[model samples]
Target: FSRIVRDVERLIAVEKYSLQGVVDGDKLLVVGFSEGSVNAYLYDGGETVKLNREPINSVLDPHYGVGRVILVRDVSKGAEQHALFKVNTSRPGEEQRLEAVKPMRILSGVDTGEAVVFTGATEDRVALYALDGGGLRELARLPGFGFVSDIRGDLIAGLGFFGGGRVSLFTSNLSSGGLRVFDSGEGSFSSASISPGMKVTAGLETAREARLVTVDPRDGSVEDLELPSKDFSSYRPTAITWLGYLPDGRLAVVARREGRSAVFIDGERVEAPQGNHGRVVLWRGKLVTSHTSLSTPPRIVSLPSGEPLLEGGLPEDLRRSIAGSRLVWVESFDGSRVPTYVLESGRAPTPGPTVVLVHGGPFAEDSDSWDTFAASLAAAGFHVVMPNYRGSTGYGEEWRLKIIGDPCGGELEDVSAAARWARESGLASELYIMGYSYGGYMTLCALTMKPGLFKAGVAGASVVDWEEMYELSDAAFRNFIEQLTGGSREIMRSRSPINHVDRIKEPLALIHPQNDSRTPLKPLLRLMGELLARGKTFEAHIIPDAGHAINTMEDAVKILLPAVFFLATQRER
Candidate 1:
């Protein structure tokens, strides 16, 4: 059994658990990153050791210990070049030794010949950091074509597919300048290459087919290998990815058909229950995979056939507390409809009040991965209505894309549509709009934008001002809004939530961390300030040292507790 690492008292509340990297077998490393925190944990084949004393962007596994590791440091921390900190995992209380990376920065390592390799800084120079006893030096500086990351062997690969498709190959000590370029042919590839035991699979969404290729590392040649690619989701090509080579010499490629998932071994597909995303690894001679989906609950798949077994979310207090069964067909206010999950405690009678939970991602489907929140809310006597509104994923990208820029002006119609549907379908009583992050933003926007839609709106880490969000967001997030709105910066301002926060008169509840780099407290604080000035009345909770995702378990619950309580029992209060 693997011992718990870090502070047992303070369990990690991961923002995006699926994105983290976990390596199995002897001297394992789990490198996880999100908008807020970057954490690395090392296991000495026993207990866990927390590394990267601070947040990190990316990580590598030479699996070295004792004052040594090639760790990627946070890029924004005043470094001209990318950094790899040498780690010391032997210490009891602390994990990394600062001296190891004291002379940090990938440029320093490259210039000193310290054998450094990285994917991309820009879309230009390819870097091969060489090392000598003196220090690290740059092996060769080649043209900036496409940047690559997630390199494993002496042969490194970086990717650039969006703008005309660029694939870069780097081989150490090559007479031909140590770098080569390849055409990824048609698609933009992400997640780079998988390890020997790993393979990536995608259900073909369109008839635009492609060939299978493997990188030789020896010559940096992406050799074409015969492999099948069809019956996959058309939204993206890289639907599923894996790296751990199976003991049976087969690469386990995963793909999602419709909403269900299946794993293939040597071209033979084995079906698994429907879930969001997972990483398949061979643990202890059996194929083990970890999955996170829309409240599907965190599960570990270990069986070869039949239903994959489950592991987490069976809390003792909640063992009999969680509810089961679907709400079935709920009629919509308009033409659209929804399937609501009315989870309530088995002990509760005549049902309880209701929590109208707005699913994030502005997508169509909701997952059962985080059902604990819903179950806990249910246990506390609240009937939670999760609406799979329009503009959701799983159904199709087209459905999701149709909602860009409030396309069709159907955001409220979707919620109201679902709410009406739920009332008609049953389980209608007291109502509150509760959401975290995107849902929070939706809650805030809808509450003010539509006004009087709910009895109360509980929002956390949400956007108070869309105009400011457009101004403050990193280019990528802004581009997403641009894509969503299908509108220019100027045009989007009119429909922004900030312009209309004054319209909301209900007892609003807001939760946020003060230092959030994204959807920052400024928006919430400003809105709160405005409300207070006008006597609009709102309860605000400011958490400390959290990011856009609001990942602290205690702080998250602390923020949600009062908001949820206020929503469920506000009339009594």
Candidate 2:
């Protein structure tokens, strides 16, 4: 049923997400998360190695010139403790293997040259230990400060959370009895950077505006840095989310705005001419970055001049499969100009079937980037409309906060308007709506409340019931949900689509990962139970050993393809 989908997954499996990178002399080693595995690629385009078959939780490079790395793996299989591995990337070999090269197992937080510092917790206190080949010895013990975020030389930074959405930032050295603590005030810190000057720069997201603030590691004093945007009065506010330091100690800030992202070098904005460019890293004494769009495949390039350094390693056949997408603006239900990307199938002029691909993270946005899934769907003759609905981040703070208190209220209306806009423009004869995570939740809402709006829908890792999800999900996500609903339980249930499941008449499919902690399996099964009780026919696929995200090739073939096939069946019927 989904032969083309299987072929696409095989060919497009090379598409990867860049998570973290480090400079090994002139060579740039970028680690990516793909297909339930971690793959490390050289920016010079040589030596690609699949580091892990299982998912890697975190990667830490101390940059101590030893070319060593620390990888953290948290097993979902009943293991409460984390597995840590110390890997040596400095070995001289044409091809280095992850399994072949032995890694040291250490239960420490940071490698402090002579000793390893490990954080331990008691009933109400946190203790730090030092392991120096002899045995585990207590270095220091402290109270309150929870998790360590960054460790530089002798300084270690810890992040602690309190009620009312307040974030506490703390820094401690091995000898310091009293910790250096700072109240990050209200809102949240989106991004953080640590420089050799012993200071940290953090992106501050407040209720009113987004700004950049620098923190002194010594005294915990914060200084606000004015983001000098050339044109910042209107839309696309001036904010430095990504802060980097050059080899010469010059600060590089990437200011994000609209569909455009630029790197600021000495107050000059260096932007990519094509589309959104990001992931700026200091390598080889220069700024190396990557760029992508609907038409352009993602490419890592060296900066100042934005020269292409290496290939993306995507299959040649699947490189230019889809036509370029058109940037569009549709007036949403509240008279807001919602930004959308319309990808044409390049089939005939006749109105054809359309797919409205919704993105997750009501807090995040759908960027103008190369999307193998959307492109493949368009190539399969379905015109796709990707709307950056309200609550999306690209449009600035005002647009980002729209869906805060009202999740299903206006965001759903924006998507409804998007479909209407696509239909009225003769872009679609039949419509299909689909999304994952928060987007999946939205698809469920469309299937219920908007009744007959779409022929069928596909949802992945969706939240059927908010209160249930709040109880089942992780603490971080629970906090996000609390902020999303303004800490009101009535509003949480009011927005859940499960209450109106009887209104859903169209065929729908659900995709979930069996090991997902974000959108737990219990809620999906609960909704499925109710759907079965109502005599509603729907399809669901649970990918084994997978998490909340559909990143792996196996998932694309097994989970994503099946959902598309189910939607296609509705069209066939």
Candidate 3:
């Protein structure tokens, strides 16, 4: 038991880093969680310099030659009401908060030295706003969730969830303030960037594959963009993670197949480390990108050589605990192949205790990436099984759209199929279910819908009653729920775990952040009342002054430690 506590502490303490963008020609702007809280730093091939006095959530995307950095800091603990701050490239540790733009949920933004364009959500509406010499101006009112992808000259391009679960590519004139949306019959636009030739280059994701295309913002004409190199075309990627134009006008694309991603520069595949990579940036005459795997923490590394420029050191013992990882496809109840990632623990024997760690996002996937929660479970002598259930990205549009309007139905079966595969393949003698956010909702769904399948379950920052949460949500979340449930009141009520609490038979543990706005704590509180009245065995932990997005180490420990402890106790029994 003491060993588990120590392992969890070590895993939480290891500082993780991400390469935000390149600024001042070669200086790397990075966001890292090193001293308990997340902060921005500038690394210039020597001692790192802190850029922000107060801990920040993230740094806006800095254009290649931007002179100043825009910092995003949440003013409302974990409620995601973020205010923007600026730091000059030459000056560090001094910040000037942008008072022009009030505190709102800053989704995505880009800094181009002269203009700072971003998308924000508030109680009233979701819109795209740009801050410049004149002042802050609302460019366009987005129908649903939107992100500012790229801006060039007088044009701005982005992707939004305007209607269905499908993504629509949008373009708005910075001077005119009129928005034009483009939809493809073939597939959804996953990523986009304004090309040097003043065209929007986008990655179109179809049923089973992805390809690059150029869209004219003037007339909405689309055409396939054939690169100079043929390697990328022949790769046949299942999804395009990200694409951008480097300083020298070379197009850099990060495409993924199966669960792993590869870095491509002008259609040539760069020799990067195994696993997944972030956006590729050219710095100091070399290519740099963020890399991660099931075993490796997120770190900035130079491509081709795959040498680490900034990384967190993993202790040898902790590293050994993660024996190995593999990708597998499990057949779901309806004959659908569910992509699942399994982590084998060195401390656990064959046919040992295993936890089916469900990922949140419902829109997200369990790729060949580093996950701290899964690592902590492995350290405590449990193999981990992560299923990229329906509605998960990286596998094509048809598979990803399966969860929309059918939450807790087909996706739940995919989770169950993964758990069954673990036991049937001799990878588990005992099974447990654990998840957060949507994944946490899955734990409740599994316990209530499929009892006796797991010994115990843990749901953190979960959704209990969709109707209650929708009523308590903001404009962005309300639209999201409406799109996910097809705006059906019956589906909202029937699919909620709170209504089916009477069916839960396994021991359950609930953890929630008090200030979480996305999935409010009110529903979880009501769930506790229902569990108590039903005489079900359960435990609850409510973290004070924290939200769904964990920025500080203390908050992370409070929310995650209880989960590991509960699972360990159940394993002993």
Candidate 4:
């Protein structure tokens, strides 16, 4: 639903291809049509153009002119099924009154129109229709399946549920995939091209073990090569797309392995060299890959056979400056190797304290999918370490299921070990643990367990109280916690941060939106009450009209951005 824009603001982008391919960032600025209405052209840092105007249904640099912009008022309208009006980036600010055209909608599949339908937000009536010029036209009329499928990229590929609850396939277009093949008791297909020509190797949600077979655009035939499952040894596939052709004219599908992803020779797994998986980036002419997660302070690696690369290591200046090691390590805390990514900064010596950031979804991994907050922290002069901890994605079904019950058991230890490693390796003199949701829970738990390792801690929309969260959270999330935590109140309470706050005596700041139905207001207010009763110095603030993740840029600068400064020297204060 949301795309990464401003990580600080947690900006997800939106675009309405109405008269033109409109871009709306986290600021909600409309970027197309009108002499002065469009103001998203000028943006260099965290200011503007960092997000889309609206929830972007379709986006691309059709002409490849402006990397982030599409030319408006240039192409013909209504020529294709989902015609995206080109955005004029040259004169981004200058605009005409307006000209109407076919706008791109997010109703991908099982919704208003199949033209660009996504999930129907439920497991019930999935109305897949074709958007006939702002009108709805139904596409599929099946039954007994969750409505999470999607269609995109002019129907190049379709990914959805099939056969009730089975497997799936990736195809060039969903026109034929609807009848092809699906896993047992699975659902249908979806037409979603996240990256151009990107095929769905597997769905992140309900469709975990689903099958995906994509079409070869070079010859237009379905690729029936079964990828490596947990048994064999090929990387569990992700969105598949042809990156480039090898000297032997073989296609490459960008495959993501256990935690790291890379490009591989088409249809040929295990046959391609490690460059197919290790780290294949073009420096000049050669293709290469590396087993690495720390790539934030990037550098340009020169190649002999590929394009210019950014993977030798971080820049020399940055390498010497940032505390995070050039080579990323999935530090084995005890038995399992948790997902931990360290972004080495470009600051001299130890800028201040190393901020150990934790991801939100306890089930979500700090994937190479990319991030914006890490860069922002690097700019603020601090070594950043983002850990996927226990229940993160990108590993596999088994790896993901590994932390189903042990949310804070071994996971919290993994984060603490990262701090210990940072201290031992002399990365930073001070350790500052940070997190959002579950990460916040882990941060609080760390403070409970240790008390003084971190200089300070910052948690936003953090999950500190588990039992109350269960009682207060909506049905879906509550049910998720039930399944995630073995559906036991004792377990939730035992693993909750609020229950054990008596042990936490360090400085902490908790920020949240007032209407955060996921982790409601009472639990936080209660924690603040407890802190006040004990006369403990803990900071708590609830954005009045805000929702769960600061909903505005102004809110980010006002409430969220201050985490960096607070984590530096305010713990003892």
Q: Considering every candidate listed, which one attains the maximal TM-score?
A: 3
Q: Give candidate 3 misplaced runs (Cα > 4 Å).
A: none
Clash count, one per candidate: 51, 1, 0, 80
lDDT of 1 by residue, 173-237 (tens): 41223554444433323224445532222122212232235655544445444444332223233
Question: Whose TM-score is higher: candidate 2's or candidate 4's?
Answer: 2
Better of 2 and 3 by lDDT: 3
lDDT of 4 by residue, 1-573 (tens): 011123333211111111111122211122221121222332222333323332122333121112234222212121112223333344343333212324222223322122333222122333233433454434443232223332344443344333222224333343332322333222222222233354333323223332244444434344433533322224445322223333333343445544444445444442332222322333223333323233332222222233222222233433343345332455656666655677777663553457788887775666553344554465456778776565565544555555666767777777887787777777766778777767777778888776887867787777777778877654345555666677677778888777777877788888776666556667888878877887677887667654453423454445556565565446334
Q: What is the TM-score of each candidate against the true structure?
A: 0.69, 0.81, 0.99, 0.59
Using TM-score as the measure, what is the rank order of every candidate, best first? 3, 2, 1, 4
Ranking by lDDT: 3, 2, 1, 4
Deviation (Å) of 176 in candidate 1: 11
lDDT of every model, 2 decimals: 0.50, 0.64, 0.91, 0.47
Q: Regarding lDDT, does 1 or 4 come out ahead?
A: 1
Residues 197-242, candidate 3, lDDT per residue (tens digit)?
A: 9999999999999999999988999999999998898999999999
The number of the candidate with the highest lDDT is 3
Any idea what lDDT model 2 has?
Answer: 0.64
For candidate 2, write residues 1-573 as lDDT tens digits. Answer: 456675456545654445245534445655554544445544445655444445555544334233544555544431212355445555422322233212222123555434445553432335554444565565455433244445566666655432333345566675442466567654555555566767776666665455667789767678875545533222233344455555566666666655656666645566554666665666756677776667555667767676666545655445444545677898888799888988877642448778899988886666667776676676566788889998876665567767878878899999999999989988888899988888899899999889888888898888788899888644445666777787799988988888888998988899888777667778889889989999997989988876764445665566667665775676666
